[PDB]
Chain A
Amino acid sequence: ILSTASVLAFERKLDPSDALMSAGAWAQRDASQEWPAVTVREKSVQTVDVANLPSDADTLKVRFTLRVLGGAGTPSACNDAAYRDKLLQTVATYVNDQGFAELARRYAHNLANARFLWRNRVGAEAVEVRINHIRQGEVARAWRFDALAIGLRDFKADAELDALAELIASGLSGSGHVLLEVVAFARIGDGQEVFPSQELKSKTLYSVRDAAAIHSQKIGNALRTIDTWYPDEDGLGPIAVEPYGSVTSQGKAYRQPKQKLDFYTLLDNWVLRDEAPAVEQQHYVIANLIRGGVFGEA
């Protein structure tokens, strides 16, 4: 009968790091290893945490590292070994039929346009994202993008973006170790307010060691904002790959289970009864498997 397993805990592929934000001046981004860190300072209005650049600095250097792991369909916990073998066979026919070439191109786009710069991008004058492949320590291959010419809405082809997509593809297929250092320089203005992530004296800001930082899961949600295959009305662009694919800002849950387009019903149709969906929805399913999570009933 091959029912769905009771536990399915997929590990997270595409591990990002906490995005340390340090400040400095534009036109010296090439010497940006001794830049001062953006410190969270108190302000009494109640007291709130604000985080600004220094008054001689217009460029926010947000830097994180990304580990692209591979082994996208193999769970870390699964009860039914027959279901595990059917799921690995399903993911293997996906990969051999069409490799990680749309997913990795979209992840390379979310690295290219600085969507991990969440609110530090909306009024930024010029964003430049430098992605360095770090193999055996130093640099294996260096990328440099204009994150504003590469849009947030459209996934357009480029020459360097295909090489970055092939790197993330080889990392997701298990064919290599991919570790990427992603450095983005946001021209915001002299002493303009930057927005690190927000902890929980009405407001606290996240800071690792006397330096502001965006959370790693926020960077991961920005990297996963690839889902354009959902039922799209109103002109909403890519949303983040979630089961019951939801936006909390808009309060709407696309890919509802009333339609047959959530990750769970698509997975239970693709694995159990072999009803293979369209190539777009199975891209979405494998993107959920790269996201990780706790799948299965209780």
Chain B
Amino acid sequence: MDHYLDIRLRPDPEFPPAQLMSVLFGKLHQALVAQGGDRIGVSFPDLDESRSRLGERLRIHASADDLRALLARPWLEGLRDHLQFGEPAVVPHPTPYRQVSRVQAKSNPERLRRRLMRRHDLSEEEARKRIPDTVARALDLPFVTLRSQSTGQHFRLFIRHGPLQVTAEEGGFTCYGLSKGGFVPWF
């Protein structure tokens, strides 16, 4: 993965950048599940860790031909007046690598209570004695707000950028463009 393409969000009078970023993330997810493979990863070069913001850039890391496939596909149809596209160019070097992984938390105790009642045949009172309300963990992480298509639920997809590393390892990527082992260059 030595090629990249910056999709920078234009400022828009009608939409905040996080809303357009989540819409672009869902469209990229649809393009990746239409594509297949595990070799296309994302990054967020304007990341602000202090306010947990993803910025206004989304950099798609892939090979050259995969980006040339994705730039012509209809996932960018309807988005081209909220985006500006660069070209698929080679990466600079030396660049440190980092991990772009999804971080999930047990943020609802009652879903865990329903799972415990399904897995141990207990009651609601045994569940509330077993799983109190101090288990609710709130993540201080940047996120995109996505709506699923198989189910109809709206969920927040928390993206955590890993610690910086000099040399990467081989690894694949999930269809959300995040890491299930893969690493991306960071610059």
Contacts and interface: CB of A to CB of B under 8 A. Distances in A.
B161 interface: no
A237 B78 contact: no
Given A122-B20, A123-B23, A193-B147, A225 B78 contact: no
Contacts of B80: 151
Contact count band on A: 20 to 34
B149 interface: yes
B181 interface: no
B16 A249 contact: yes
Give the interface SS of chain A, mostly helix, strand, loop or mixed: loop
Contacts of A240: 13
A238 B19 CA distance: 19
Nearest to B26: A123
B6 to A, nearest CB: 14
A125 interface: yes
Interface in B1-27: 10-16, 19-20, 23, 26-27
Given A151-B81, A153-B81, A189-B149, A122 B15 contact: yes
B13 A122 contact: no
A234 B11 CA distance: 7
A250 B56 CA distance: 14
A148 interface: yes
A208 B83 CA distance: 34
B77 interface: yes
Nearest to A187: B78
Given A125-B78, A235-B10, A191 B15 contact: no
B10 to A, nearest CB: 6
A124 B82 CA distance: 13
Give the interface SS of chain B, mostly helix, strand, loop or mixed: loop
A177 B82 CA distance: 36
B163 interface: no
Nearest to A52: B152
A126 B78 CA distance: 7
A223 to B, nearest CB: 13
Contacts of B122: none
B164 interface: no
A272 interface: no
A219 interface: no
A148 B147 contact: no
Nearest to B27: A123
Interface string B117-161: 000000000000000000000000000000101001000000000
Nearest to B81: A152
B74 interface: yes
B11 A235 contact: yes
Contact of A122 (B74, B82, B147): B82
Contact of B13 (A124, A148, A192, A239): A239
Shortest beta-carbon contacts, A-B, top 8: A152-B81, A247-B13, A236-B11, A124-B78, A239-B13, A151-B81, A153-B81, A122-B23
Interface of A: 52, 118-119, 121-127, 148, 151-153, 189, 191-193, 225, 234-240, 247, 249-250
22 contacts: A52-B152, A119-B15, A122-B19, A123-B23, A123-B27, A123-B78, A125-B74, A126-B77, A126-B78, A148-B77, A152-B82, A153-B81, A225-B13, A235-B10, A235-B84, A236-B10, A236-B12, A236-B13, A237-B13, A240-B13, A249-B12, A250-B11
Given A249-B12, A249-B14, 13 more contacts: A52-B152, A118-B14, A121-B78, A123-B79, A124-B78, A127-B78, A225-B13, A234-B11, A235-B11, A236-B10, A236-B11, A240-B13, A247-B13
